[PDB]
């Protein structure tokens, strides 16, 4: 990583040209060059490259991936003053707290909504159960009721969760990674409803992000499910669209997993102060968020001063109604295993090559912790050993804060040995 410049990674569905404009302003004002990139699969590439001390100075993703990055030692603790923290909503800071430490700057709150074509469907269905009948009517007019991305479990989760599916059981502020909720009666009911839609030819198992976006924006389908980043392309499409609450299932709200788009600082970056400068004083300003939002809408931004304006938009009100019906995702390391397992279950069941029950049974075990935990007594001994070692051997306070955060998340002797090695390898 090159000292004296910033390299920033952000997903290709976000307002990266807008962010590059913020980068250009930073360079104009400070002399420091900013390069924005949008690599494919960056949520998988970041851990790969950062593990060897490489990669971007700043990484943007929803917060759910960030506990894994932090636990792996890839993220510095961020250092905003209390005065800066007060400029963002408290509920957003909780999404980016890991083992007591702030690990990223929250940018914006993302929840899926039902997006509908008002010309085809002036009053969109309140319930999932209404959709088959609606699709039959629209099929007789050469249209379809609903198309959305069936390849990414983010989009199907709101239906799986509606009647009781859950990721990890959450009690007394803690997630139990041995207690997974993807093959309970509610998860089965929701995924069965989706698979039935496909069986009855109301949806196609092959539908992906591009296929659904193209169909909605051409007026071929009456409804889609998507986030605020999608509104830009609909605005130029001519479709007269609305954004509303997701349909209920078995009388229960759809419960989207809510993401907070967040910006973390690579632990190996020699540019941590520049990164803080850019994020606090350029990006998290009304002007900076406007530039990104104008490119692709962010959703409900974390910066109070700008959200006061955006919240007046009915599309943002709908976003936040859906967010309130769902749940802020956990940020725990096990989230990537969860998402891979649910991805597999939905694709395999939707393709008809496996039953819903078998798909979700496999996912239930595949999402859960694979390795055993140490006993409570042994684990406390390992943690106290490492805390002593960090204080003994690591002179830099920021580096100590990072390692102390990682200590909080070890689960077994192998984790203890792995983290001990990382501490012993710490450079000056
Ligand atoms: O599908 C699983 C995927 O869900 C979320 O990714 C969202 C992301 O949060 C949105 O900002 C947008 O980019 O759509 C993605 C869905 O394709 C999780 O954040 C991600 O970790 C998980 O793999
Ligand atoms: O929060 S409490 O601990 O009080 C009850 C939590 N508990 C979780 C599991 N679901 C099963 C739904 S179903 O999938 O079986 O319908 C019921 C509610
Ligand atoms: O935060 S980063 O990881 O990017 C680099 C932080 N780094 C720590 C060490 N000090 C030495 C001050 S001096 O006495 O050498 O001037 C410079 C700043
Ligand atoms: O020192 S402490 O009492 O806290 C725990 C020491 N204890 C030694 C035995 N191994 C068994 C795993 S294995 O070696 O059989 O793989 C677990 C850890
Ligand atoms: O949800 C709505 O109704 C907004 C109004 C303009 C475009 N869609």
Short description:
This protein has 428 residues and is an alpha/beta fold.
Task: Explain how this protein is built.
With 428 residues, the chain is an alpha/beta fold. The protein has a domain at 113-257 and 333-364: 3-Layer(aba) Sandwich (D-Maltodextrin-Binding Protein, domain 2), CATH 3.40.190.10. Helix content is 45%, strand content 16%. The protein contains 19 helices and 15 strands. The strands form 4 sheets. Strands 1, 2, 3, 6, 13, 14 and 15 form a 7-stranded mixed beta sheet that branches. A 4-stranded mixed beta sheet has the order 8-11-7-12. Strands 4-5 form a two-stranded antiparallel sheet. The longest helix is centred in the C-terminal third of the chain and has 18 residues, at 376-393. It binds a molecule of 2 linked components (GLC-GLC), piperazine-N,N'-BIS(2-ethanesulfonic acid) (3 copies) and proline. Residues 378, 381, 413 line the site of one piperazine-N,N'-BIS(2-ethanesulfonic acid).
